[PDB]
Amino acid sequence: ASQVRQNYHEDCEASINKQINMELYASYVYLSMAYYFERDDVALPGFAKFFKESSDEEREHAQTFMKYQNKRGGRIVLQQIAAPSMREWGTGLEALQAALDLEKQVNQSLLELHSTASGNNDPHLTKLLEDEYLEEQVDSIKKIGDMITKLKRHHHHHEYMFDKELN
Amino acid sequence: ASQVRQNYHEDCEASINKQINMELYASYVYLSMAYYFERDDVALPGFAKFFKESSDEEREHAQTFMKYQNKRGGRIVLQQIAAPSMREWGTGLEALQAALDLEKQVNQSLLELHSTASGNNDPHLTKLLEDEYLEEQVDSIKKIGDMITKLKRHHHHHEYMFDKELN
Amino acid sequence: ASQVRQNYHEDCEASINKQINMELYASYVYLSMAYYFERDDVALPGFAKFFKESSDEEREHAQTFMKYQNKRGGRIVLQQIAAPSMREWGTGLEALQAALDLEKQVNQSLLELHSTASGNNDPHLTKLLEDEYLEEQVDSIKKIGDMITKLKRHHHHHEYMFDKELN
Amino acid sequence: ASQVRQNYHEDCEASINKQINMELYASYVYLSMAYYFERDDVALPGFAKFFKESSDEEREHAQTFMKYQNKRGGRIVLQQIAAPSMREWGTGLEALQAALDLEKQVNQSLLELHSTASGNNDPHLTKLLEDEYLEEQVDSIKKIGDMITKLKRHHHHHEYMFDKELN
Amino acid sequence: ASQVRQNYHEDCEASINKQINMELYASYVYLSMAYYFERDDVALPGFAKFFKESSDEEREHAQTFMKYQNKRGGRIVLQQIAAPSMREWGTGLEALQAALDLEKQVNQSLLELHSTASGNNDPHLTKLLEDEYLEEQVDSIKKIGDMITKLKRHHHHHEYMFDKELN
Amino acid sequence: ASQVRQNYHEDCEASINKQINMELYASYVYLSMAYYFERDDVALPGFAKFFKESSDEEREHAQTFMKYQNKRGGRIVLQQIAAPSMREWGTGLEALQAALDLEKQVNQSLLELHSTASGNNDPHLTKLLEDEYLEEQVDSIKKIGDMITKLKRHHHHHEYMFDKELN
Ligand SMILES: [Fe+3]
Ligand SMILES: [Fe+3]
Ligand SMILES: [Fe+3]
Ligand SMILES: [Fe+3]
Ligand SMILES: [Fe+3]
Ligand SMILES: [Fe+3]
Ligand SMILES: [Fe+3]
Ligand SMILES: [Fe+3]
Ligand SMILES: [Fe+3]
Ligand SMILES: [Fe+3]
Ligand SMILES: [Fe+3]
Ligand SMILES: [Fe+3]
Ligand SMILES: [Zn+2]
Ligand SMILES: [Zn+2]
Ligand SMILES: [Zn+2]
């Protein structure tokens, strides 16, 4: 194996490559959303900017894991990247609900990666997860939750005024 | 329940709430020491600034935990803040000695929360305590321990000189 | 008593202590509110911030009174700080209504404290109440009343827009 | 259909959607090269930076096309992004040669899109392809051809110095 | 023991001392290297400077551990610092290979020290190892590996050019 | 032998090497004093800064001699650095008294090297010792001698006041 590899379990090496794929798929979804709210019959620039930023940060997530793979001497495996779930994301409100669920789904995967890393006594990897993914996951889920509470109060008039505060 | 809650055990929720009350209780004790060192018959302006700053940090500890209750999607439930042990704190040394004892009692309970957090595999909350509370506790216990040594020396003139250090 | 004490009747000394408790219990109420309006299921950052500031300002009324007690040679006597009524304030309009009433409870005590100081021919203490307390109380009550008038115009879409004017 | 749609053939709409998936795929391939040249057993810091910017520029080729799909009032349709042809990319020169090939396959699809645009009398779309795509690919093919020539002249001391020019 | 000591098991106290010795012996190795590469018959200023910095950084890992021991109320126990293996490292590639292996010896102890702290439920000490030591160790090991990969391209003319990139 | 060696007796070479070990040994002793004045039960931050700076200058003395071994074309041969005499240094006065004794033992050996250098008519090395080491020794012995006088006075309060001089 690699000259730098030390205390690096192959089960961890492999969940990193599975997680990179999930980070990228999450990137693709926020990209689909981002430009959907830019359609002439949707015209929500606030929501569109928020989901463009989400897709960039999901891209950054994936890069930080590929950098990590190489740091420990593992070898990236990247699969295909599935097409997003849906493609018509409905209201801004249904988009945020979709995103809330996708961000909880990623946190479940990151809490699993953490347990797999604790179970192999990889305290470097648990440090990575705590300091760069667990805290970003909890803050974002709270961010989105806050937004869905503001935006559940029906009219299209309300979405548009909420949108402007996003922008 | 909550739209953000994920992997936050109800025992962690409950022990965050006891700990909000305990931090505020510490604020109240230090606040009492602060102003007692301002009595015209005590008039040590260095201990007064030290304990008033201590009182302030203890309220940030509590608020950081209340912020945290809400990030994870638990409910803040506040309780009555007991009045301090004393209102007359004796000497600066005897107040330091009581400071040190209560920072030590705050750390025992923070480490108990870390033990609850671990047992419920909540890495998000063990990281909160490691980075935000356990290093501040140790450093405080050590600064207070250092000053107790400098002051321990008996004399009234030595204390008024140590006091100007802390101004 | 004290080397400094002069024309400071003990009923005023004792009322200043009971007033310190009320102010500190007023702080606790507002801090409750402050972090309630930060819950993901509430998400009114403007209200939250208004109650944070109020909570901080009640803590300072308390410190001024404790500074004052020491200035006049009386002795601070701290007691327990009760937890609020209910920690679920409901809407912002309902919280503000609780605040209006709380500010009037503290105005009525402050005015009683001022009659005690007048009855006992303490003009230094009348002057403290007039300058440092009664004016903030009438400013605060009026502001709150102004805000309630604005907010009574029942849907949750109005509240979000008022919450931004306050942010 | 869309209230903005004018003179936008559905074949061109479909070819933009196909081309979006090709820009993204090129993004992914350049992402694999980028991070493969940062392996501890490859460690070519310049080749890696060159492909990072390539990967990023491909991503923005795709977002222009999706930006454009909406201007003309078509509907973005994204599909799976295939995994890159490889995982190892060999020497820096082999990665360029694969990138010479790849940019040429993109230029070929771009030029076919132009012919579709021309046959369906879309001068707005021919304009876009001429002004935002066709010139960057001729310019990129020439840059890469130049580098291949420099690097060809087998020994591996020479490759590390070429990386030097690249960082 | 100490007025400050709390939840600091004596096996961790003793391991911190043995770790201080290792770090200080790691400093000695690098200082040897540093001035070897400055001999007139060697004359690799870049290598020399790299090993000077490394030597200085090992001295600081040692100081942090001695600061830490005092923070937790244990007692520093210093012992002799062995002279290196051989003081003739030969080529730069051979020195770097010795450094890679040394950094992995210190990584394996640091990871053992971290299992000791975990076994003894010291989360303050796990946190110190994670933040302050394990991350530098994986960065350092990977860097060294990267440098060895670059340098294996056997003639002494390559080495001089790599030595300048490092200068 | 060396391409730079000229008029550098092998006895001078050998005595430079004993002296590198002796300077590093001094660094280690001062380093021990440095951190012992940081124990929570000693807590004299002025002696700690004085001895930590002393430890640092002693390592520059050693490195200046290793640089020098290589200027003249001799071989650095490093040896084991003995652990300090003590780890508990008693009072600041008793540590100063031990500082003074070891600066006096360093000067005896520097003057012995000057005597070896002279006898081997090496004016280059007698000038090194005159300008770089013998004036620093005398000045140190005198500063330490001055402080021993200021401190000698018995009392705990006087030492904590002298200590703030040195901060
Ligand atoms: Fe992510
Ligand atoms: Fe995410
Ligand atoms: Fe605290
Ligand atoms: Fe505290
Ligand atoms: Fe008030
Ligand atoms: Fe008030
Ligand atoms: Fe492209
Ligand atoms: Fe391209
Ligand atoms: Fe180290
Ligand atoms: Fe190291
Ligand atoms: Fe010296
Ligand atoms: Fe010396
Ligand atoms: Zn951390
Ligand atoms: Zn050749
Ligand atoms: Zn060459």
Side-chain angles (χ1 to χ4, degrees), chain D residues 5 10 13 19 48 60 67 79 84 90 98 105-106 120 127 135:
Chain D
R5 194 159 173 149
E10 50 178 33
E13 166 164 13
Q19 186 75 37
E60 307 243 48
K67 256 130 188 156
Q79 295 283 285
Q105 312 173 259
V106 173
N120 287 304
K127 189 198 137 296
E135 234 183 358

Side-chain angles (χ1 to χ4, degrees), chain E residues 2-4 21 24 28 31-32 35-36 38-41 59 63 66-67 70 73 75-83 87-88, chain F residues 2-4 24 28 31-32 35 38-41 52 59 63 66-67 70 73-84 87:
Chain E
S2 266
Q3 73 182 320
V4 287
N21 190 265
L24 287 175
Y28 208 16
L31 173 97
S32 168
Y35 282 87
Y36 174 84
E38 272 194 11
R39 295 165 63 77
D40 65 275
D41 64 336
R59 187 176 51 265
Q63 283 169 17
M66 286 149 81
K67 272 166 229 151
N70 271 344
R75 286 302 85 144
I76 280 139
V77 178
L78 295 168
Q79 300 199 324
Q80 70 217 341
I81 305 165
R87 195 160 328 313
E88 271 199 69
Chain F
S2 208
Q3 82 181 320
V4 310
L24 293 161
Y28 204 15
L31 185 67
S32 183
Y35 281 88
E38 281 185 7
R39 306 194 343 187
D40 71 87
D41 54 354
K52 201 248 165 186
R59 197 190 37 273
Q63 274 159 197
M66 299 150 80
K67 274 144 198 162
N70 286 331
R75 186 160 300 264
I76 296 151
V77 192
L78 294 151
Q79 301 268 348
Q80 178 169 265
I81 310 157
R87 178 277 319 261

Side-chain angles (χ1 to χ4, degrees), chain E residues 92-151:
Chain E
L93 176 57
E94 287 168 291
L96 294 176
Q97 273 161 343
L100 177 63
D101 292 331
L102 190 66
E103 292 299 340
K104 284 150 108 202
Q105 298 159 32
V106 181
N107 204 30
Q108 196 208 22
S109 172
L110 286 166
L111 276 152
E112 292 163 15
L113 189 37
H114 179 293
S115 176
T116 297
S118 304
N120 277 125
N121 310 295
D122 202 322
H124 189 263
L125 176 50
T126 65
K127 186 230 149 283
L128 173 80
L129 291 172
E130 268 154 58
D131 296 0
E132 292 288 294
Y133 286 103
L134 296 188
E135 257 204 303
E136 179 52 46
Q137 218 55 46
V138 156
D139 297 337
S140 153
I141 295 180
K142 169 73 164 61
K143 194 160 305 231
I144 295 183
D146 286 351
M147 284 157 97
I148 281 160
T149 295
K150 278 162 206 206
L151 243 191

Side-chain angles (χ1 to χ4, degrees), chain B residues 100 103-105 107-108 111 114 130-131 134-135 138-139 141-146 148-149 152, chain E residues 2-7 67-68 70-73 75 121-124 126-128 130-132:
Chain B
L100 184 80
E103 295 304 346
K104 273 166 126 162
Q105 278 168 176
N107 213 357
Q108 195 59 51
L111 295 162
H114 192 285
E130 291 174 14
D131 304 351
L134 299 176
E135 262 214 318
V138 154
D139 286 356
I141 293 169
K142 178 72 167 74
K143 186 78 214 102
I144 295 162
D146 282 352
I148 285 159
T149 315
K152 256 188 313 206
Chain E
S2 266
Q3 73 182 320
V4 287
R5 195 191 184 123
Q6 189 162 24
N7 195 47
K67 272 166 229 151
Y68 186 87
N70 271 344
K71 259 181 197 169
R72 295 297 299 281
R75 286 302 85 144
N121 310 295
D122 202 322
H124 189 263
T126 65
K127 186 230 149 283
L128 173 80
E130 268 154 58
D131 296 0
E132 292 288 294

Side-chain angles (χ1 to χ4, degrees), chain B residues 5 30 55 58 63 83 96-97 113 116 119 130 142 161:
Chain B
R5 192 164 197 143
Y30 276 129
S55 191
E58 297 296 2
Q63 274 159 197
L96 289 166
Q97 273 161 352
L113 189 121
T116 313
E130 291 174 14
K142 178 72 167 74
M161 297 271 139

Side-chain angles (χ1 to χ4, degrees), chain C residues 109-161:
Chain C
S109 172
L110 286 166
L111 276 152
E112 292 163 15
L113 189 37
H114 179 293
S115 176
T116 297
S118 304
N120 277 125
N121 310 295
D122 202 322
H124 189 263
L125 176 50
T126 65
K127 186 230 149 283
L128 173 80
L129 291 172
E130 268 154 58
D131 296 0
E132 292 288 294
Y133 286 103
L134 296 188
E135 257 204 303
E136 179 52 46
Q137 218 55 46
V138 156
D139 297 337
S140 153
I141 295 180
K142 169 73 164 61
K143 194 160 305 231
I144 295 183
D146 286 351
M147 284 157 97
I148 281 160
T149 295
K150 278 162 206 206
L151 243 191
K152 282 174 55 212
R153 310 247 148 174
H154 46 246
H155 206 263
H156 266 174
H157 159 76
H158 197 69
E159 186 161 64
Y160 167 74
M161 309 296 319

Side-chain angles (χ1 to χ4, degrees), chain C residues 58-127:
Chain C
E58 298 302 6
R59 187 176 51 265
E60 274 146 13
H61 303 171
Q63 283 169 17
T64 305
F65 273 135
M66 286 149 81
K67 272 166 229 151
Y68 186 87
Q69 190 88 277
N70 271 344
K71 259 181 197 169
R72 295 297 299 281
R75 286 302 85 144
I76 280 139
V77 178
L78 295 168
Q79 300 199 324
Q80 70 217 341
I81 305 165
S85 63
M86 57 200 42
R87 195 160 328 313
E88 271 199 69
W89 312 97
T91 64
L93 176 57
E94 287 168 291
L96 294 176
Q97 273 161 343
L100 177 63
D101 292 331
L102 190 66
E103 292 299 340
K104 284 150 108 202
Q105 298 159 32
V106 181
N107 204 30
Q108 196 208 22
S109 172
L110 286 166
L111 276 152
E112 292 163 15
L113 189 37
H114 179 293
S115 176
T116 297
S118 304
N120 277 125
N121 310 295
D122 202 322
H124 189 263
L125 176 50
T126 65
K127 186 230 149 283

